[PDB]
Design an enzyme around this catalytic site. Structure first.
Site, mmCIF file in Angstrom:
data_model
loop_
_atom_site.group_PDB
_atom_site.id
_atom_site.type_symbol
_atom_site.label_atom_id
_atom_site.label_comp_id
_atom_site.label_asym_id
_atom_site.label_seq_id
_atom_site.Cartn_x
_atom_site.Cartn_y
_atom_site.Cartn_z
ATOM 1 N N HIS A 49 20.599 5.306 37.141
ATOM 2 C CA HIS A 49 19.169 5.263 37.385
ATOM 3 C C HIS A 49 18.876 5.033 38.845
ATOM 4 O O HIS A 49 19.758 4.673 39.621
ATOM 5 C CB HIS A 49 18.487 4.185 36.517
ATOM 6 C CG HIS A 49 18.577 2.792 37.062
ATOM 7 N ND1 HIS A 49 19.769 2.213 37.448
ATOM 8 C CD2 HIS A 49 17.626 1.853 37.247
ATOM 9 C CE1 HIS A 49 19.541 0.974 37.847
ATOM 10 N NE2 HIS A 49 18.251 0.727 37.736
ATOM 11 N N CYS A 103 17.833 -1.002 43.082
ATOM 12 C CA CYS A 103 18.724 -1.726 42.185
ATOM 13 C C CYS A 103 20.086 -1.802 42.852
ATOM 14 O O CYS A 103 20.499 -0.867 43.527
ATOM 15 C CB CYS A 103 18.853 -1.005 40.842
ATOM 16 S SG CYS A 103 19.940 -1.843 39.654
ATOM 17 N N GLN A 121 15.598 -3.483 28.908
ATOM 18 C CA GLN A 121 14.176 -3.624 28.627
ATOM 19 C C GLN A 121 13.750 -2.430 27.767
ATOM 20 O O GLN A 121 14.162 -1.295 28.014
ATOM 21 C CB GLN A 121 13.375 -3.671 29.934
ATOM 22 C CG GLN A 121 13.724 -4.869 30.813
ATOM 23 C CD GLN A 121 12.964 -4.894 32.130
ATOM 24 O OE1 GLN A 121 11.734 -4.906 32.151
ATOM 25 N NE2 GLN A 121 13.699 -4.911 33.239
ATOM 26 N N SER A 144 10.885 -4.451 36.176
ATOM 27 C CA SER A 144 11.609 -4.369 37.442
ATOM 28 C C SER A 144 10.903 -3.416 38.399
ATOM 29 O O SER A 144 10.988 -3.574 39.614
ATOM 30 C CB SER A 144 13.045 -3.872 37.222
ATOM 31 O OG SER A 144 13.794 -4.762 36.410
ATOM 32 N N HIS A 147 11.483 3.567 37.141
ATOM 33 C CA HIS A 147 12.814 4.169 37.150
ATOM 34 C C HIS A 147 12.841 5.661 36.868
ATOM 35 O O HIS A 147 11.930 6.202 36.261
ATOM 36 C CB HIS A 147 13.711 3.572 36.054
ATOM 37 C CG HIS A 147 13.794 2.080 36.038
ATOM 38 N ND1 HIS A 147 12.750 1.274 35.649
ATOM 39 C CD2 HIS A 147 14.839 1.248 36.275
ATOM 40 C CE1 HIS A 147 13.143 0.011 35.642
ATOM 41 N NE2 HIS A 147 14.410 -0.027 36.018
#
Length: 153
Positions: A49, A103, A121, A144, A147
Site C-alpha cells: 500500500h 507508512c 482497520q 491513518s 491509502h
C-alpha cells in the site's frame, strides 16, 4: 452479475460509462468479468500500500516528514495524482510507495505481508479482500489517512 462490489456506472455531467467497485473505490473502463459460484473471499491475502497522511491522521507524522499539515482534501488530491501516474504507466506502484508513502512499510516498497480478517482497520480490510490478485484499489480512508492498496497474493 459482476464480481463483489462492482457495478456499471456513468459519470455525471459527463457521459462516460465505466465500472466502479463500491468496496475498493476502484474504477476502470474494462468490464471486470467475462461459471464459478460459492467462492466467497480468500481467507488470507498479501497486499502492498501507499499511505498519504493528513492533519487528522491518528499520528500526523511519518518518516517522510515530522509534521503533516496537509488537509484531508489535499491528501486525496495527492492520492488521485499517484493513481493517475500509475495508470498512465509513467510510474510504478513500488517506486512511488518506496518514496512517497507515509507508512514505514515504504522500506519494503509498501509490502505489508499476508494477513487475515480482523487484523487491519475495517475499511482497509474490506478493500483488500475485495481485490483480486494484481488489482489496485481507489482511495481508501482509515484512521491513518488515505491509502492506495495493491493485492499481490
Amino acid at each position: 452479475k459482476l464480481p463483489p462490489g462492482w457495478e456499471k456506472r456513468m459519470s455525471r455531467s459527463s457521459g462516460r460509462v465505466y465500472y466502479f467497485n463500491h468496496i475498493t473505490n476502484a474504477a476502470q473502463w474494462e468490464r471486470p468479468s467475462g461459471g464459478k459460484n460459492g467462492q466467497g473471499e480468500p481467507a488470507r491475502v498479501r497486499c502492498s500500500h501507499l499511505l498519504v497522511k493528513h492533519s487528522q491522521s491518528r499520528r500526523p507524522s511519518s518518516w517522510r516528514q515530522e509534521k503533516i499539515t496537509r488537509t484531508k482534501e489535499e491528501a486525496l488530491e495527492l492520492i488521485n495524482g499517484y493513481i493517475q501516474k500509475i495508470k498512465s504507466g509513467e510510474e510504478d506502484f513500488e517506486s512511488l510507495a518506496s518514496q512517497f508513502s507515509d507508512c514505514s512499510s515504504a522500506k519494503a516498497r509498501g509490502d505489508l505481508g499476508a494477513f487475515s480478517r480482523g487484523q487491519m482497520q475495517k475499511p482497509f480490510e474490506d478493500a483488500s479482500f475485495a481485490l483480486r490478485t494484481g488489482e489496485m484499489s481507489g482511495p481508501v480512508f482509515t484512521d491513518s489517512g488515505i491509502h492506495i492498496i495493491l493485492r499481490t497474493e
